[PDB]
Ligand binder design. Sequence first.
Ligand SMILES: *[C@@H]1O[C@H](CO)[C@@H](O)[C@H](O)[C@H]1NC(C)=O
Length: 181
Amino acid sequence: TNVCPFHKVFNATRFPSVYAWERTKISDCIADYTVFYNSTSFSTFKCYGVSPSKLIDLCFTSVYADTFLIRFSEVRQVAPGQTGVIADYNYKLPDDFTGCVIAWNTAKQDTGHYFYRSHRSTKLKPFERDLSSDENGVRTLSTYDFNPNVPLEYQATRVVVLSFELLNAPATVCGHHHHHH
Ligand SMILES: *[C@@H]1O[C@H](CO)[C@@H](O)[C@H](O)[C@H]1NC(C)=O
């Protein structure tokens, strides 16, 4: 298997709006997570259920990459069992979450009008997506203008959620060293 398509996911011209986040299936690859933790580009790299350090030793049966665009202020909501407009009405990470979250501040590039759900009748189920714009005829989706000139807690920020499972089925996405190194 050839190397894992991270640059094609990460350095794409556009990231989705967060209410319409997008999944990607990754398999048959040899993953190189080295790019992340650049400390001058990746401002947040935090794993749940495994050690970011232990990613280099592990093989995964299925890896999905959920992607979207929010503000710096709201990055902290992408965590198991957190509360917020994002976690309650946009993108929900399970309580039993296994995976990583990577986030970096693309403010000078991902500029424009992006959207987010502010209100919903019920909160969200884990990993559920709601692409509806109305409830009773009112727009249920409020707007972000991302600009270079807004303060940091308010700036554009791209997020990726690598969600994997270590159960049965052929082991398909293997770190550079799943041969006991
Ligand atoms: C880390 O980020 C900087 C940002 O300018 C980039 O130049 C560099 O190539 C990245 N990583 C490496 C492998 O040096």
